[PDB]
Amino acid sequence: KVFGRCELAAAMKRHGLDNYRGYSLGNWVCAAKFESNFNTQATNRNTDGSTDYGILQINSRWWCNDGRTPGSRNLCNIPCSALLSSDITASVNCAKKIVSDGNGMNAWVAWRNRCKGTDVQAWIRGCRL
Template sequence: MGALGLVTLLACLSAGGWGKIFSRCELAQTLQDSGMDGYEGYSLANWVCLAFYESGFDTAAVGANADGSSDYGIFQINSGWWCQDDRTPSENLCHVHCQDLLNPDIKDDINCAKRVVQDPLGMEAWDDWKKRCEKQDLTEWIEGCDL
């Protein structure tokens, strides 16, 4: 993404102020209510850990990749495969526009994350999950939450 494109995107996001940073327990509750605990064999704590390391629980997070694709939303869904951003050729396997993953309503993010983990890589599709969450004691991610 060019510098002007990045500045424009950041200006739109901050001017609109329509992103949301979830608290750990608020996200855990939302994910549990959406059937994520145990989905495809991954505990709720795995999902919370993933969201923290991918986006800091920020629905408006956008990350740029060396291949020209971008990652969007609380789960950092990639524009090269999972969503369409009008800049990157995409398979758009979640059938969603990437911008729709940046608002406080994370239903579409959750549906897309469910689609991602149905593929053979599962959560290994996310490098941060592999590095920071896989094979770790994740109890702290949901500890103290009233679930």
């Protein structure tokens, strides 16, 4: 599924991501934009041989099991394929664990490099929320 901007903002809010660990909804939409271009089926291989999955590019190195990431953990206790669903419940549940891990949204290098400190409210501008 390729979400629309205000459609994803609505889905995230409904699953309790807005102001989770103090991160406004525009932070989460901005992260999704640059991680996946709002595509639930996005996958990308890391140099280390782990893979990032879904709207928030959650990494098999720590958070999900893909069966091909030697020495990795599965701290969200999900198959990585669950993170490619059109329903973002699994991605949001797992993202709550990630942003709680100590470094907040810095876990998402594209959030740090492209969203952090920017006018993230622009991402939910005009959305009926």
